[PDB]
């Protein structure tokens, strides 16, 4: 019943005291955070409190969309020796700091995601050459489907790959994806290995990567410029915004204190120093 | 009335009983007492084995030595208890297996010693590596130290043999080993053994994972890390030392899918 | 639905419990045929394209 938008408990008036009750004392040893209120130690007047936690509820903490990647595509001239670059990005929040740290506060979570795609383009060669408005395709290849090979092979016939066709110069594109985990919650951390090295086998085939699980494998996104070759080369970038919605979490962990290094929890040398200098005696 | 102390506790599971006089009460992690897999959240279809008493009993891991140079110690579950009688056995003979735990970290000094040990129960305790060139590379053997456990260190030392890398952990203490500030560690279920007050810690952890039941040999659920909050000093003594012993205990454990015995290359 | 360790499936195997015995003047080597299928509790999800066909050009 107590919703997020409820007023915090009104602080009671309390006067002088000389009793055997000891509020003030604890023994953090138990592990219990001593639960005192202002009125417990000092004298308080009555106060009708109006502040509510409404803007810090799990929902609101993740309520902002966030950049997750920068995918590069381009459409060079047909005369060019280099091949028309189509980008393929594996879907993982771990590619950028920002969302990851916000997600790390929790061991597990269930969240239906909403993706937004802002696509910006530009010329490269200093030619007063033109280019007609381009049309992009963002194809979601789920784990195991054939990943595109050429900017123009069959794979793009999207028989079943849910795709999006975005014309440039229009409002950014957006799609909703429900919770797609193979579990009951997405694992932000996986302690263990996929393969158990067996006693009657080669170490090679018995070896995997620590903290690498399928739990967080979700296929790739394929992006290409649909318009064919154009005399004047035009590169473009596709920024992907992810905003977790209908979110819920489990088990708090301490926030990441030193610069992240790679997909694991691992850290690099030099970066292991977070706090600064300050004196024990200077306020 | 009958002087029942929150210092005098008695834990009993299976054929063992651990009493205690200087306890700091006990913590039931997250406020959920362990329990058997429900039918609402059941998953695998075959009948589940419930070893009960044959498994629900206090096993004692090997004791460690607490000194001034002790930086910390760490143990994974069910890992550590992989050689513990039937629970050790029932662990290898199944694909799936969920289990709770009751960790009773004992360690006493005397009114003349001082210091503080924080027993933390980190769910999904992923530890950091030793090489600064290769991520998440640590090998299985190193990752699962068993009943002996591994230890924290005062400084990060990179693994420089790229010919034959050590592939082990090198967890730096103040960073709770996984690049986070220790001072915050207090968010996971825990208790502090402060030599002046108590001589044991008691955390009861209910199975916590992303699945209903999972592979034991593969994925470690819990992580018990013990770090010295306040260093150990005694008398006017240059070399004080008191031992710390962990006695863990599986609870409400159940396994599914009997097969042939798994023999893991532990070395 | 792909080759993955984490979510591997297991192994099926067939072994002679006894041995196949035949009387005299009978083919000494006979064969078996195997069939697979889903039970009533089988279900799939999240449609994707297939690797079992390709149109080159």
């Amino acid at each position, epitope marked *: 019943a107590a919703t997020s938008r409820d007023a915090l408990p009104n602080t009671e008036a309390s006067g002088p005291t000389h009793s055997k009750e000891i509020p003030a004392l604890t023994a953090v040893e138990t592990g219990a955070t001593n639960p005192l209120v202002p009125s417990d130690t000092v004298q308080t007047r009555h106060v009708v409190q109006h502040r509510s936690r409404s803007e810090s509820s799990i929902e609101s903490f993740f309520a902002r969309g966030a950049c997750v990647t920068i995918m590069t595509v381009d459409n060079p001239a047909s005369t060019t020796n280099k091949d028309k670059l189509f980008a393929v990005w594996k879907i993982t929040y771990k590619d950028t700091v920002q969302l990851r740290r916000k997600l790390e506060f929790f061991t597990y979570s269930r969240f239906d995601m909403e993706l937004t795609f802002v696509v910006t383009a530009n010329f490269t060669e200093t030619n007063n050459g033109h280019a007609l408005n381009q049309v992009y395709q963002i194809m979601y290849v789920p784990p195991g489907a054939p990943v595109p090979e050429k900017w123009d092979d069959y794979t793009w016939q999207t028989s079943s790959n849910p795709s999006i066709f975005y014309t440039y110069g229009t409002a950014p594109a957006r799609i909703s994806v429900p919770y797609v985990g193979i579990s009951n919650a997405y694992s932000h951390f996986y302690d263990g290995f*996929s393969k158990v090295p067996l006693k009657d086998q080669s170490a090679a085939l018995g070896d995997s990567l620590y903290g690498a699980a399928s739990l967080n494998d979700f296929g790739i996104l394929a992006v290409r410029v649909v318009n064919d070759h154009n005399p004047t080369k035009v590169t473009s970038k596709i920024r992907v915004y992810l905003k977790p919605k209908h979110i819920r979490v489990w088990c708090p962990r301490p926030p990441r204190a030193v610069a992240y290094y790679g997909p694991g929890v691992d850290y690099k040398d030099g970066t292991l120093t977070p706090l600064s200098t300050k004196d024990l005696t200077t306020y | 009335a009958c002087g029942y102390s929150d210092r005098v506790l008695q834990l009993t599971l299976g054929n063992s009983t651990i009493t205690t006089q200087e306890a700091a009460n006990s913590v039931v992690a997250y406020g959920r007492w362990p329990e058997y897999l429900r039918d609402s959240e059941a998953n695998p279809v075959d009948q589940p084995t419930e070893p009960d008493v044959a498994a629900c009993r206090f096993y004692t891991l090997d004791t460690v030595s607490w000194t001034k140079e002790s930086r910390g110690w760490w143990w994974k579950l069910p890992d550590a208890l992989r050689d513990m009688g039937l629970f050790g056995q029932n662990m290898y003979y199944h694909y799936l297996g969920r289990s709770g735990y009751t960790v009773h970290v004992q360690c006493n000094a005397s009114k003349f010693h001082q210091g503080a040990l924080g027993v933390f129960a980190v769910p999904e305790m992923c530890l950091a590596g030793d090489s600064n060139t290769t991520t998440m*590379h640590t090998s299985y053997q190193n990752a699962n130290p068993g009943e002996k456990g591994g230890t924290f260190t005062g400084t990060f030392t990179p693994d420089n043999n790229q010919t034959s890398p050590a592939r082990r952990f090198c967890p730096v203490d103040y960073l709770l080993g996984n690049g986070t500030l220790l001072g915050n560690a207090f968010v996971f279920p825990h208790q502090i053994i402060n030599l002046r007050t108590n001589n044991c810690a008691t955390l009861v952890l209910p199975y916590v994972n992303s699945l209903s039941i999972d592979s034991m040999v593969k994925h470690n659920n819990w992580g018990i890390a013990i770090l010295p909050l306040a260093p150990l000093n005694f008398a006017s003594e240059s070399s004080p030392e008191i031992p710390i012993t962990l006695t863990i205990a599986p609870m409400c454990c159940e396994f599914n899918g009997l097969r042939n015995i798994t023999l893991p290359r532990l070395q | 639905t792909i080759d993955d360790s984490f979510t591997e499936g297991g192994y099926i195997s067939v072994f002679y419990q006894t041995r196949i015995v035949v009387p005299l003047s009978t083919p000494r080597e006979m064969d078996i045929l195997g069939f697979v299928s889903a039970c009533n509790d089988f279900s799939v999800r999240l449609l994707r394209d297939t690797t079992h066909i390709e149109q080159k050009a």
Partner: nanobody, 126 residues
Framework: QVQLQESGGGSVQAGGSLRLSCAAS????????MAWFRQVLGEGREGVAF????????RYADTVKGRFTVSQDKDKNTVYLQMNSLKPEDTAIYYC???????????????????WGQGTQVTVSS
């Protein structure tokens, strides 16, 4: 298709040290399992050392192990092969293959390798 632009052979004598560079053209990220090889003149076409793109873990061939070290240029998509102690028998047409990957499984020889390199030959004179 992934392209593996290799570089750059030569027949220096015993004990020598050269190196091969091979690009991801290609989309080096989580996929490719950049491996090394050398075709022992018609005998002959063995796998030298192989690196994992995702983590940077190397494995070598029982022959090359130690002398040869596989290096990785993550950001500029190149995988090197510091060919050390080049002895006369280090005469063979070198290779650079790169397959895909198993999410978490280490890049080994029994695993890859879908795509092929140029095959730039390095010979060790006698």
């Amino acid at each position: 298709q992934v392209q593996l632009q290799e570089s750059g052979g030569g027949s220096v004598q015993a004990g020598g040290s050269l190196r091969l560079s091979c690009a991801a053209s290609g989309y080096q990220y989580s996929l490719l399992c950049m491996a090394w090889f050398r075709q022992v003149l018609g005998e002959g076409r063995e796998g030298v050392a192989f690196i994992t793109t995702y983590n940077g873990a190397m494995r070598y061939a029982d022959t090359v192990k130690g002398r040869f070290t596989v290096s990785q240029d993550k950001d500029k998509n190149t995988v090197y092969l510091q060919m050390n102690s080049l002895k006369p028998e280090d005469t063979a047409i070198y290779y650079c293959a790169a397959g895909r990957w198993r999410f978490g499984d280490i890049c080994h020889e029994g695993s890859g390798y879908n795509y092929w390199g140029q095959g730039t030959q390095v010979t060790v004179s006698s």
